[PDB]
Design a protein around this ligand. Structure first.
Ligand code: MG
Ligand code: MG
Lengths: 195, 233, 204, 211, 240, 235, 222, 244, 231
């Protein structure tokens, strides 16, 4: 289970993604970044079947970067999420579907609002204040149902996220080797190097 | 991929000093039902080759047509079609063997086991086997199906190796073949009494014998057999 | 495994006197896990309303598809599409995927702008039209909805009464289904006004 | 069993030599390291043919790169050609484990793990194959960044030995490589039949065995 | 499909369709490229026959292929969009597979290869476009400036011009540009580029476009007032 | 109009004969084969002084043991080179060995006549393919757009070809050294070139068994030019 | 259901000398518990001083050999009658086998000849193309019986010099053609005793600079 | 063979011009004049129907002004049948964009796509080009109100005010004279009609010989409305401006 | 004139000019001679060089162990047609385990060349071939023309000045046909035949090219010092 979490607060979106890469019986890596920057104010985390995850993320990344150059303009998070959903919805009826679940965290510079989209491999899109894929949600959703507010600061969002990770580290059976946390706001995307 | 429906049983053959003999019964079975009783499973090609086929009869009839068409095609723009550039047993066999292996490789086989018997231009005897898998082999004696299990042992008593071939006459070889066909009628539940036999000699040419019967059978001892153990009456 | 019951959800539609009503729950889940409580299953193309239950990706996909087709219809025909015509468009569109179907249970609702006649219809996942006078049901609690609608419904109800009947049909059916609930929305539709109400229901 | 780790003096690459077909030991003398170019190495694990065929094919693609671009290919681009290729064949049944190890000026010493599942990972340490766990046990517990080229070569050699001993499907001999700024350097074939006893005596380890 | 061989040899060994494509480039508005010590500048002519234009939305002459490479052109405008689109797609494709942005030489070689392909493919005519491709390679501070043409040949230039009256501005650049000491600063490079266009342009108002590209994806387009200051300074020094 | 694959009354393909005229307009390229190696040299011919001459790539590597020089519509050569490189590398993949120079040349020449109404016209470029293999040693081939290739001891193609070929007729012998061949290419290039020959407007290259294919530096060629001037002034 | 594969049995053996190489194989062909032929050649002269055998499913083995012989023919046409080296042949065969990676030739392939320095060479393949040059290799049904014997009697494995007691190994003295043929004959005689698919006859092909020579020996027919 | 009869539609002249494009433009120069004027608070589209008849059913007729989506419209000049082929393609393209990104297509992107299609017919395929020139009037949230034109060459440009079809030289001079940047829709309506009234080849400009449309933010609050004028509404605006 | 633009057009007198122009390319080509006895069949070819630095263009191509040809005209077209023969000879061996008959090889070439003369877009082959071979009916010599016409002959010659060699063979017919079991004498007759087509130039060591096939003789080509014996 490749833990990926997302929380949308007052003025930013925070994505947390596990660092472990386990192939069979061995943890091959403990510092893996399960995310790609699609545009300066849009970040996508991902989790699913080996190989497909990165292949899909980079394919989406390339397409959005192509759009940015062509139009000299950044697509809204809503527009990017719809593009991503259609690709997955197309994929599910293919010969060999992309087995990838994603979270898309973005800051809309037009509306001055943070936005978080949860999309599964079937192409099921939902906009949420907080989201998760896989078994992580079974612990974190109910925890966030209790501790979340729409007017929270970024620092409060990080403390709230630490509470999620602590619970996961206590009750989940796999050692996912901690998480890489990234914040998406009006100034762009930055990584929290100490977590 | 399919399953065979109307089938032909053993085809047996052997080399002798001046040529080759091949035989096969005239039955077309439909599972346990002995449905067709007048089926010719030896198909001559020219006056120097006989193809004996076992297995699926519908596929046999398809092969029969390929060979008929092969003769037609070889005659085209060929003034030496009845002489130097006539069809040889080796040509006919390799053609079939090519087809059989191609069909198995497409997973749509011709459900047969084939023996091409004949005599070459230089008088050399030709006897080679090919089946639905494209598997090929040659031997002084060749047999398909039940014949492989019961006929080969009898025919190998006559020609156990290559050096025994010049020592074997046509009368001795035909006698062995006819005996083997009787044994198969005793023991193969999908065989018939009626059969066809063909001889390809380098001197006397192709002799095709039809409407042969298994004769001189031993059954009298059956009367003395009573019960399955303890039954005296 | 069964695509039609992974996400869960329900839709119901009713006719009244010079009015129609269509309602849906708000849940979206992954089997036992509840994910979203804001997943509306009713859409509208002009004055024609469409509710869709089943696999959520197909629900979203079909909405986008019928928005596409109705927008072109309008540009060419120079008029909005009517419920009877839209119903045939849905049936056509679903049957063209006969051997690779969308796992959905659509429900059309609306009033003919010319005749003023109320109209509802339902479909199976491959196109078969169920044009009923009284009511149409769809979803994981369709059995429950059939029982509530068949007992509570009576013809020629006024808008404000029809609201109560359809709301109670939905609510009590949803409460007997594990995969339905988490909120509900009801549309009351008249020839030239449409009211949308969010219902207060138990959140379990 | 095959490993590759990064340290102060570059990269160590060590592999075993056994090839099996069930319980049958088919070969003890196979080359699981492919010299792609003077600065690139490839390791092989899984399907023998799959690894051999596609890694020699990889070398042809890396050569074409430096013909067109008048420049040596990077480890990143070389590893990605192979990973993109196997991804096309995903589901067909390919079985490959590969570490593309090498050096370039702009990257420095680099190791990429490439998988027939389509996985492509950059990292400092990798152990792959049926004996990876045994090699990880020795390598991890004795690894430091500041090993000497001499101590590092030994650790990689010793880690394979450990796996050749315990893993039934690993063994034969140890092939060693060292990769620096100036390319790779072969450090010999080491038969386990002699290396085991030598290490046991000198190191004082392997007390599980009667010797 | 339409397979007709349009580009073919003539008795004197010329491919007229390729040569007539160069005449379309000769008709196009003038474009100039000058590289300094630590920068490259792309100058472009805007014909003032078209006023009442909306300069916000009108397609600009200089196009970004990636964040570190730009492409200007002379010739058919519609044709240039097809090359620019293909170039942009290849740039992202290169980043995707090689995990590194294109070199300016590589991008030029691709665009030139496309142009060549259209000179010996059935049912198609050559592109009526010559391009100037400029930028800086990844992690490199050496300026790059390349030219392409309909035939498909390409080459690197210290400074170059294409389009109508390019013969005149090339004459200017050949005497004014020194290889041993190129324009050391951005100012000197832009000044020389504006000077060269002023030999041909007519009025120095909205007829000159300037785009400066610096290392590490630092690309900016100068405004009307900024360019007008160069035009003012050049002529005031000329009055002597 | 008329077919692209049409024969003339003399029995020649119009388009092939016309492409040969385009090659005559191209810049000069000279190749000389010796027992110590094969030398390839070209005239760069920059259209303007602002054009950075080092970007003019008219000599090209196909493999470590095969080089190539071009003359004519040089843009057409890019796909021919790409095919040659692929053919060379592919053969090494299939057979674990270097490919014969003749076999490589034959593979390139198979493209030549693949035109009709496949590509729309013949190539407008000639190639001098030089290389070495174990069987036939140091070799030089001339590949035309007709699909024909001749082996040569020495060969000149381009605008000054017939004048250069006559000069190669007299100068070539079977005991030429590599150094002698280098100077000989420079000598003949200087003779047929419009502009004065120097290290910037002319380029040398060679292929030897030991070092493989190498394009010469401008500093290395400059010395060979200076060595040439002195030896001509010596008598 | 149709099974496109079969098992024709047989066993083959390749040994490389200092200036020669042998490729041996029994002449028996079988299906299940029946004998098809007591003499059906399995090792072939493919031209250019190369011998080849593809053991397992005969139909696939015949096809592969037939294709490689064809490859040699076209190598001459395309490359000015150049001789195909053993290392180049091996690489060509890898591509023939891997070309059917997803519908394999169900055979164990071995080729033998001389390398470009004149030394003896044996190359061994798996069904899907992985190959390796070896000094010794048995393949087929009785390969498990024979290879251990060859490790012992050809590469002197587990053999040491008396008196030293395990300290000094047996030196790797080269083997003559006469010494190799003895090991081959003993290998097949032993395999015939304990493996039911091995017997009838043994045909050996010896390769030297002078060409390709054949030797035939009888085996037990039970 | 067939080569004998091939016109070769996609070739250059010795001067470097595309024959068929140039001749297509000559065709368009005889088509009814269409004018587009962009203001600060909206866009005007005016167009002249060609020599009509009294028996033509005008209220159900449409030959000049077409709707691409709710935000974008086009004025046609040239072959109507050719224009409808492209219009239906443009309508589909807008819907494809909306389905993909869930946002209305930016005006320029739609214009570029149609212009790229036209370009293709001039470079490959051996077919004749579309004998059509468009004036695109549209709105999006990036650039606001926008006017574009495309022609058979596939080249497109942006405008404050522009004319296509017949008498564009005369029409463009009149627009260039009276147009100002701070202009409003009501003033632009008057300018468009006055320009047609002077450039027309007819004796007098009447309601039955015109098609008219506006794109206004004059819709209740922050949104855009398209108004295709009815015959009676064109008659009223002709009286209001003082032409009839 | 007006009827020579393409191969799909008959002239008013029923002529195909593009085929006739292709035939002209053969006459420009260097001379080559073919002849046979009952036991052997021989090809002799005069190779042509570009200049003194150049090599002499190869004229003879091997098709199988028992068959091959010599060319005159467009060499690339000979490579295409010889490649086709190689494949057809090969198909006959792989499928039927049968060496391809020389007569049937001629029939296949005829039909391949014909398709190019009746279809629009393509062009006729611009080369003439002399095919020799030894099959089950003994030695054979064929003459191929790109019109499609193939002819079995005792001896012949094609190319420039080929009429001289053809007349010689017409006189020598009764002599060289009887040269059985003697390859060197049959080649001598071929070398003497091709000598009747020479002007100015003579047969040198790198100029001459000979090939032979027979009863117990595979198709082999002789070049260089291997033909010095016959000069
Ligand atoms: Mg979801
Ligand atoms: Mg036995």
């Amino acid at each position: 289970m490749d833990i990926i979490l997302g929380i949308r607060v007052q003025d930013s979106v925070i994505l947390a993604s596990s660092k472990a890469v386990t192939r069979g019986i061995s943890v091959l890596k403990d510092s893996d970044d399960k995310t790609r920057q699609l545009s300066p104010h849009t970040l996508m985390s991902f989790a699913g079947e080996a190989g497909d995850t990165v292949q899909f993320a980079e394919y989406i990344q390339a397409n959005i970067q192509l759009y940015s150059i062509r139009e000299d303009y950044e697509l809204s998070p809503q527009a990017v999420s719809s593009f991503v959903r259609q690709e997955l919805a197309k994929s599910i009826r293919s010969r060999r579907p992309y087995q990838v679940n994603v979270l898309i965290g973005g800051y809309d510079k037009k509306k001055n609002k943070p936005e978080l989209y949860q999309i599964d491999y079937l192409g099921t899109k939902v906009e949420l204040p907080y989201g998760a894929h896989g078994y992580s949600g079974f612990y974190t959703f109910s925890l966030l149902d209790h501790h979340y507010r729409p007017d929270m600061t970024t620092e409060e969002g990080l403390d709230l996220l630490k509470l999620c990770v602590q619970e996961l580290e206590k009750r989940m059976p796999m050692d996912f080797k901690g998480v890489i946390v990234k914040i998406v706001d009006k100034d762009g995307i930055r990584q929290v190097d100490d977590f | 991929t399919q399953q065979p429906i109307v089938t032909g049983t053993s085809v047996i053959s052997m080399k002798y000093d001046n040529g080759v003999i091949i035989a096969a019964d005239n039955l077309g079975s439909y599972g346990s039902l002995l449905r067709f009783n007048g089926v010719e499973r030896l198909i001559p090609v020219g006056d120097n080759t006989v193809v004996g086929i076992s297995g699926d009869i519908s596929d046999m009839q398809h092969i029969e047509r390929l060979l008929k068409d092969l003769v037609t095609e070889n005659a085209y723009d060929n003034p030496l079609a009845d002489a130097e550039e006539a069809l040889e047993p080796s040509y006919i066999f390799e053609y079939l063997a090519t087809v059989m292996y191609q069909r198995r490789s497409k997973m749509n086989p011709l459900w047969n086991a084939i023996i091409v018997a004949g005599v070459q231009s230089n008088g050399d005897q030709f006897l080679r086997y090919v089946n639905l898998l494209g598997v090929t082999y040659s031997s002084p004696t060749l047999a398909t199906g039940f014949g492989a299990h019961m006929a080969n042992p009898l025919l190998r008593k006559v020609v156990d190796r290559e050096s025994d071939i010049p020592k074997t006459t046509v009368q001795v070889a035909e006698e062995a073949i006819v005996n083997a066909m009787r044994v198969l009628y005793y023991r193969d539940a999908r065989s018939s009494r009626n059969f066809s036999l063909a001889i390809i000699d380098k001197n006397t040419g192709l002799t095709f014998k039809k409407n042969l019967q298994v004769e001189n059978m031993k059954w009298d001892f059956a009367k003395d057999i009573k019960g399955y153990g303890t039954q005296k009456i | 495994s069964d695509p039609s019951s992974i996400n869960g959800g329900i839709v119901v539609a009713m006719t009244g006197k010079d009015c129609v009503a269509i309602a849906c729950d708000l849940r979206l889940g992954s089997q036992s896990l509840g994910v979203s409580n804001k997943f509306e299953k009713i859409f509208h193309y002009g004055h024609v309303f469409l509710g869709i239950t089943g696999l959520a990706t197909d629900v979203t996909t079909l909405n986008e598809m019928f928005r596409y087709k109705t927008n072109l219809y309008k540009l060419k025909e120079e008029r909005a599409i009517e419920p009877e015509t839209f119903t045939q468009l849905v049936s056509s569109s679903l049957y063209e995927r006969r051997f690779g179907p969308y796992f959905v249970g659509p429900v059309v609702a609306g009033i003919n702008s010319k005749s003023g006649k109320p109209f509802i219809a339902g479909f199976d996942l491959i196109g078969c039209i169920d044009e009923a006078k009284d009511f149409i049901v769809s979803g994981t609690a369709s059995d429950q909805l059939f029982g509530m609608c068949e007992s509570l419904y009576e013809p020629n109800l006024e808008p404000e009464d029809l609201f109560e009947t359809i709301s109670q049909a939905l609510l009590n059916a949803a409460d007997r289904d594990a995969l339905s609930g988490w909120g509900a929305v009801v549309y009351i539709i008249k020839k030239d006004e449409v009211v949308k109400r969010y219902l207060k229901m138990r959140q379990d | 069993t095959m490993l590759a780790f990064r340290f102060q003096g570059g990269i160590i690459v060590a592999v075993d030599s056994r090839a099996t077909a069930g319980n049958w030991v088919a070969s003890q003398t196979v080359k699981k390291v492919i010299e792609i170019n003077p600065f690139l190495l490839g390791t092989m694990a899984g399907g023998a043919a799959d690894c051999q065929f596609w890694e020699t094919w990889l070398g042809s693609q890396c050569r074409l790169h430096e013909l067109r671009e008048k420049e040596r290919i990077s480890v990143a681009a070389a590893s990605k050609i192979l990973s993109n290729l196997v991804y096309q064949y995903k589901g067909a049944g390919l079985s490959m484990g590969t570490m593309i190890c090498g050096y370039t000026r702009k990257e420095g010493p680099t190791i990429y793990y490439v998988d027939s599942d389509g996985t492509r990972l950059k990292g400092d340490i990798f152990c792959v194959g049926s004996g990876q766990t045994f090699a990880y046990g020795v390598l991890d517990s004795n690894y430091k960044w500041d090993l000497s080229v001499e101590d590092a070569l030994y650790l990689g050699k010793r880690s394979i030995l450990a796996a050749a001993h315990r893993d039934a499907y690993s063994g034969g001999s140890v092939n060693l490589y060292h990769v620096t700024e100036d390319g790779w350097i072969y450090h010999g074939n080491h038969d386990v039949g002699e290396l085991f006893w030598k290490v046991k005596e000198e190191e004082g380890s392997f007390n599980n065995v009667i010797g | 499909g339409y397979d007709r061989a349009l580009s073919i040899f003539s008795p004197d060994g010329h491919i007229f369709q390729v040569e007539y494509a160069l005449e379309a480039v000769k008709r196009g508005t003038c474009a100039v490229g000058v590289k300094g010590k630590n920068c490259v500048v792309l100058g472009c002519e805007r014909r003032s026959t078209l006023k009442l234009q909306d300069t916000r939305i009108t397609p600009s002459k200089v196009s970004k292929i990636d964040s570190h490479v730009v492409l200007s052109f002379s010739g058919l405008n519609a044709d240039s969009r097809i090359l620019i689109e293909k170039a942009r797609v290849e740039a992202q494709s290169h980043r995707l597979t090689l995990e590194d942005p294109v070199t300016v030489e590589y991008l030029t070689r691709y665009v030139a290869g496309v142009q060549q392909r259209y000179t010996q493919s059935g049912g198609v005519r050559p592109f009526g476009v010559s391009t100037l491709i400029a930028g800086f390679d990844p992690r490199d501070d050496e300026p790059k400036l390349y030219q392409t043409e309909p035939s498909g040949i390409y080459s690197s230039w210290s400074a170059q011009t294409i389009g109508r009256n390019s013969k005149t501005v090339r004459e200017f650049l050949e005497k004014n540009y020194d290889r041993k000491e190129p324009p050391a600063t951005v100012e000197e490079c832009v000044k020389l580029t504006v000077r060269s266009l002023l030999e041909v342009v007519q009025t120095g108002a909205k007829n000159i476009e300037i785009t400066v590209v610096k290392p590490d994806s630092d690309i900016v387009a100068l405004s009307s007032e900024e360019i007008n200051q160069y035009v003012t300074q050049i002529e005031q020094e000329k009055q002597e | 109009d008329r077919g692209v694959s049409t024969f003339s009354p003399e029995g020649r393909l119009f388009q092939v004969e016309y492409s040969l005229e385009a090659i005559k307009l191209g810049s000069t390229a000279i190749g000389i084969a010796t027992k110590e190696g094969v030398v390839l040299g070209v005239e760069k011919r920059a259209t303007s002084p602002l054009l950075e001459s080092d970007s003019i790539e008219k000599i090209v590597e196909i493999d470590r043991h095969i080089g190539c020089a071009m003359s004519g519509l040089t843009a057409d050569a890019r796909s021919m080179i790409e095919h040659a490189r692929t053919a060379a590398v592919t053969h090494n993949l299939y057979y674990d060995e270097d490919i014969n120079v003749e076999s490589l040349t034959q593979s390139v020449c198979d493209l030549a006549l693949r035109f009709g109404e496949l590509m729309s016209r013949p190539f407008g470029v000639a190639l001098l393919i030089a290389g070495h293999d174990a069987d036939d040693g140091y070799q030089l081939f001339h590949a035309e757009p007709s699909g024909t290739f001749y082996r040569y001891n020495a060969k000149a193609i381009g605008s000054g070809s017939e004048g250069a070929q006559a000069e190669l007729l007299n100068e070539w012998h079977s005991s030429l050294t590599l150094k002698e061949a280098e100077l000989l290419v420079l000598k003949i290039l200087k003779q047929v070139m419009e502009e004065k020959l120097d290290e910037n407007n002319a380029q040398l290259s060679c292929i030897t068994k030991q070092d493989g294919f190498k394009i010469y530096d401008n500093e290395k060629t400059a010395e060979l030019i200076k060595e040439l001037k002195e030896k001509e002034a010596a008598e | 259901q149709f099974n496109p594969y079969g098992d024709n049995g047989g066993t083959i053996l390749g040994i490389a000398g200092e200036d020669f190489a042998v490729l041996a194989g029994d002449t028996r062909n079988i299906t299940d518990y029946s004998i098809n032929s007591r003499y059906e050649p399995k090792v072939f002269d493919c031209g250019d001083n190369i011998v080849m055998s593809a053991n397992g499913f005969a139909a696939d083995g015949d096809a592969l050999v037939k294709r490689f012989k064809n490859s040699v023919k076209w190598y001459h046409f395309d490359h000015n009658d150049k001789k195909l080296s053993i290392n180049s042949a091996a690489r060509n065969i890898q591509h023939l086998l891997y070309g059917k990676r997803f519908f394999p030739y169900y055979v164990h392939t071995i080729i033998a000849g001389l390398d470009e320095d004149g030394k003896g060479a044996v190359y061994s393949f798996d069904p899907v193309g992985s190959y390796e040059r070896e000094q010794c290799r048995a393949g087929g049904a009785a390969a498990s019986l024979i290879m251990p014997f060859l490790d012992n009697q050809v590469n002197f494995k587990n053999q040491y010099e008396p008196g030293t007691n395990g300290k000094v190994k047996k030196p790797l003295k080269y083997l003559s053609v006469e010494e190799v043929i003895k090991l081959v004959r003993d290998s097949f005689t032993s395999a015939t005793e304990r493996h039911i698919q091995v017997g009838d006859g043994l045909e050996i092909l010896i390769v030297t600079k002078d060409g390709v020579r054949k030797e035939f020996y009888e085996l037990k027919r039970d | 063979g067939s080569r004998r009869y091939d016109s070769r539609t996609t070739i250059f002249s010795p001067e470097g011009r595309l024959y068929q494009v140039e001749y297509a433009l000559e065709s368009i120069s005889h088509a009814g004049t269409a004018i587009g004027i962009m203001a600060s608070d909206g866009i005007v589209l005016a167009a002249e129907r060609k020599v009509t008849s009294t028996l033509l059913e005008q209220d159900t007729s449409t030959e000049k002004l077409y709707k691409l989506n709710d935000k974008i419209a086009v004025a046609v000049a040239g072959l109507t049948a050719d224009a409808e082929i492209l219009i239906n393609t443009a309508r589909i393209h807008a819907q494809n964009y909306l389905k993909t990104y869930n946002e209305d297509i930016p005006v320029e992107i739609l214009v570029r796509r149609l212009s790229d299609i036209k370009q293709g017919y001039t470079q490959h395929g051996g077919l004749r080009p579309f004998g059509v020139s468009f004036i695109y009037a549209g709105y999006d949230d990036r650039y606001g109100y926008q006017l574009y034109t495309s022609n058979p060459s596939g080249n497109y440009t942006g405008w404050k005010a522009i004319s296509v079809g017949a008498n564009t030289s005369a029409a463009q001079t009149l627009l260039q004279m009276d147009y100002k940047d701070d202009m409003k829709v009501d003033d632009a309506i008057e300018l468009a009609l006055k320009t047609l009234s002077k450039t027309t080849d007819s004796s007098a400009l009447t309601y039955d010989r015109l098609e008219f449309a506006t794109i206004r933010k004059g819709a209740n609050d922050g949104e855009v409305y398209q108004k295709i004028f009815k015959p009676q509404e064109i008659k009223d605006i002709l009286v209001k401006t003082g032409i009839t | 004139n007006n009827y020579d633009g393409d191969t799909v057009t008959f002239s008013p007198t029923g002529r195909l000019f593009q085929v006739e122009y292709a035939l002209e390319a053969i006459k420009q080509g260097s001379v080559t001679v073919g002849l046979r006895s009952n036991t052997h069949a021989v090809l002799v070819a005069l190779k042509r060089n570009a200049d003194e630095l150049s090599s002499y263009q190869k004229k003879i191509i091997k098709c199988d162990e028992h068959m091959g040809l010599s060319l005159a005209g467009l060499a690339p077209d000979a490579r295409v047609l010889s490649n086709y023969l190689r494949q057809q000879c090969n198909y006959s061996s792989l499928v039927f385990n049968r060496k391809l008959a020389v007569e049937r090889a001629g029939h296949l070439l005829c039909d391949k060349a014909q398709k190019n003369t009746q279809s629009y877009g393509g062009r006729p082959y611009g080369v003439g071939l002399l095919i020799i071979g030894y099959d089950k009916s003994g030695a054979h010599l064929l003459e191929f023309q790109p019109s499609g016409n193939v002819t079995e002959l005792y001896g012949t010659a094609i190319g420039a000045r080929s009429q001289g060699a053809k007349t010689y063979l017409e006189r020598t017919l009764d002599t060289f046909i009887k040269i059985d079991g003697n390859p060197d004498e049959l080649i001598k007759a071929g070398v003497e035949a091709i000598s009747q087509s020479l002007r100015d130039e003579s047969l040198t060591v790198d100029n001459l090219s000979i090939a032979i096939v027979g009863k117990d003789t595979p198709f082999t080509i002789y070049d260089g010092e291997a033909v010095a014996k016959y000069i």
